């Protein structure tokens, strides 16, 4: 049906954009898509795209003059292609397939790394098409005399350095296999996103700018990484895995710590707050060029980019945060350390839409990154938890709340 008002393209065009993307996504998911050398890895959690009229209309409005470069539309990644011909374009629909196949040819021509990680080398356009967490699609073309621009925008970002375009696994069998969004369906190996759950703010009613869904994203992503690291499961670029943690505390969400992150977030200056403005609190910051970026997507991406420091740069088996590891050229580790800091247990975050970037701030109480100190005490999980605390060996986190 589509139900789009835009007369710039036809339904037949919308169906050709949409089908090309989903057929190619399903091929990847099924492990059937060619690479430069063998087959691409199969995909779990590979979502089917749905058409979005609002996304389509906005993109259509931006290309009326066949501009050079990117539209700068909010909340989305963009793919773009320009054609020239002295004969003009009496049937622009015939350029849909070679545009999309030209975007797609990224992977076959250059290849994709063993973890399906984005590294560029010419995967930009392929990454937007294939990105597993993307659920919405909007495309449009415009004729400008002898010039044709064909473009698609996507509600997910696939060009982030070292982030996996998709996770290797079997394609979904039922909707229970789709882990990215709750209550997803499954159509022949493609996950299908259901309707959006309404955003609530019951955890911290005095604060403005944050919602419960975003809080639980930060909190669960933090805790799950701390659980993983305490049990010896997290890879370290400096050798093997990071050591087991003896007394890794489970984080709780804290409204006051949130209110403090919100204050700094609302200033819209990409830098650390002064330590006296967050007294006794650690801090992690994040921005992305994408404007008005989904707050949950921004929370998950920020958390992972901070965490990735361990597998990218490394800490080593002593687990000590040293000035020698700190001062490494082009290597930062301090965002990861604060996330893994065992004495740190209150989390409060903010995601603020600034006019220049989506800004993400998390604050940490009591706050780590003591120079010359271990990031966490090393030993068997739960071994050194405080006298009255609970801990399971299958999670490895000391908790009292």
UniProtKB/TrEMBL annotation:
<feature type="disulfide bond">
    <location>
        <begin position="349"/>
        <end position="362"/>
    </location>
</feature>
<feature type="disulfide bond">
    <location>
        <begin position="268"/>
        <end position="354"/>
    </location>
</feature>
<feature type="disulfide bond">
    <location>
        <begin position="139"/>
        <end position="152"/>
    </location>
</feature>
<feature type="disulfide bond">
    <location>
        <begin position="204"/>
        <end position="255"/>
    </location>
</feature>
<feature type="disulfide bond">
    <location>
        <begin position="178"/>
        <end position="191"/>
    </location>
</feature>
<feature type="disulfide bond">
    <location>
        <begin position="172"/>
        <end position="186"/>
    </location>
</feature>
<dbReference type="GO" id="GO:0005576">
    <property type="term" value="C:extracellular region"/>
</dbReference>
<feature type="disulfide bond">
    <location>
        <begin position="385"/>
        <end position="398"/>
    </location>
</feature>
<protein>
    <submittedName>
        <fullName>Ancylostoma secreted protein 1</fullName>
    </submittedName>
</protein>
<feature type="disulfide bond">
    <location>
        <begin position="66"/>
        <end position="144"/>
    </location>
</feature>
<keyword id="KW-0732">Signal</keyword>
<feature type="domain" description="SCP">
    <location>
        <begin position="12"/>
        <end position="162"/>
    </location>
</feature>
<dbReference type="InterPro" id="IPR035940">
    <property type="entry name" value="CAP_sf"/>
</dbReference>
<feature type="disulfide bond">
    <location>
        <begin position="4"/>
        <end position="53"/>
    </location>
</feature>
<dbReference type="InterPro" id="IPR002413">
    <property type="entry name" value="V5_allergen-like"/>
</dbReference>
<dbReference type="InterPro" id="IPR014044">
    <property type="entry name" value="CAP_dom"/>
</dbReference>
<dbReference type="InterPro" id="IPR018244">
    <property type="entry name" value="Allrgn_V5/Tpx1_CS"/>
</dbReference>
<dbReference type="Pfam" id="PF00188">
    <property type="entry name" value="CAP"/>
</dbReference>
<feature type="disulfide bond">
    <location>
        <begin position="382"/>
        <end position="391"/>
    </location>
</feature>
<feature type="domain" description="SCP">
    <location>
        <begin position="213"/>
        <end position="372"/>
    </location>
</feature>
<dbReference type="InterPro" id="IPR001283">
    <property type="entry name" value="CRISP-related"/>
</dbReference>
């Amino acid at each position: 049906s589509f139900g789009c008002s835009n007369s710039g393209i036809t339904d037949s065009d919308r169906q050709a954009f949409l089908d090309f993307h989903n057929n190619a996504r399903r091929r990847v998911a099924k492990g059937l898509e060619d690479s430069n050398s063998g087959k691409l890895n199969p995909a779990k959690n590979m979502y089917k795209l749905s058409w979005d009229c609002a996304m389509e209309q906005q993109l259509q409005d931006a290309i009326q003059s066949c501009p050079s470069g990117f539209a700068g539309i909010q909340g989305v990644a963009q793919n773009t292609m320009s054609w020239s011909s002295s004969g003009g374009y009496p049937d622009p629909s015939v350029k849909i397939e070679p545009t999309l196949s030209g975007w797609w040819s990224g992977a076959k021509k250059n290849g994709v790394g063993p973890d399906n990680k984005y590294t560029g080398g010419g995967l930009f356009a392929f990454s937007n098409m294939v990105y597993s967490e993307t659920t919405k699609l909007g495309c449009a073309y415009k004729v400008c005399g002898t010039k044709l621009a064909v473009s698609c925008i996507y509600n997910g970002v696939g060009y982030i350095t070292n982030q996996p375009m998709w996770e290797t696994g079997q394609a979904c069998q039922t909707g229970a296999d789709c882990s990215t969004y709750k209550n997803s369906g499954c159509e022949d190996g493609l996950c299908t996103k259901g309707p959006d759950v309404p955003e609530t703010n019951q955890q911290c009613p005095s604060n403005t700018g944050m919602t419960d869904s975003v809080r639980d994203t930060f909190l669960s992503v933090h805790n799950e990484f701390r659980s993983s690291v305490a049990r010896g499961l997290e890879p370290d670029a400096l050798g093997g895995n990071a050591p087991k943690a003896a007394k890794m505390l489970k984080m709780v969400y804290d409204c006051e710590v949130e209110a403090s992150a919100i204050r700094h977030g609302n200033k819209c200056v990409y830098q650390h707050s002064h330590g006296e403005d967050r007294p006794g609190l650690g801090e992690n910051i994040y921005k992305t060029s994408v404007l008005k970026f989904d707050k949950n997507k921004a929370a998950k991406q920020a958390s992972q980019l901070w965490w990735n420091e361990l597998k990218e740069y490394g800490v080593g088996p002593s687990n000590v945060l040293t000035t020698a590891l700190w001062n490494r050229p082009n290597m930062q580790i301090g965002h990861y350390t604060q996330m893994a800091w065992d004495t740190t247990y209150k989390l409060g975050c903010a995601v603020v839409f600034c006019n220049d970037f989506t800004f993400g701030v998390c604050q940490y109480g009591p706050g780590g990154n003591y120079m010359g100190h271990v990031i966490y005490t090393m030993g068997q999980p739960c071994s050194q938890c405080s006298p009255g605390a609970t801990c399971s060996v299958t999670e490895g986190l000391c908790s009292a709340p």
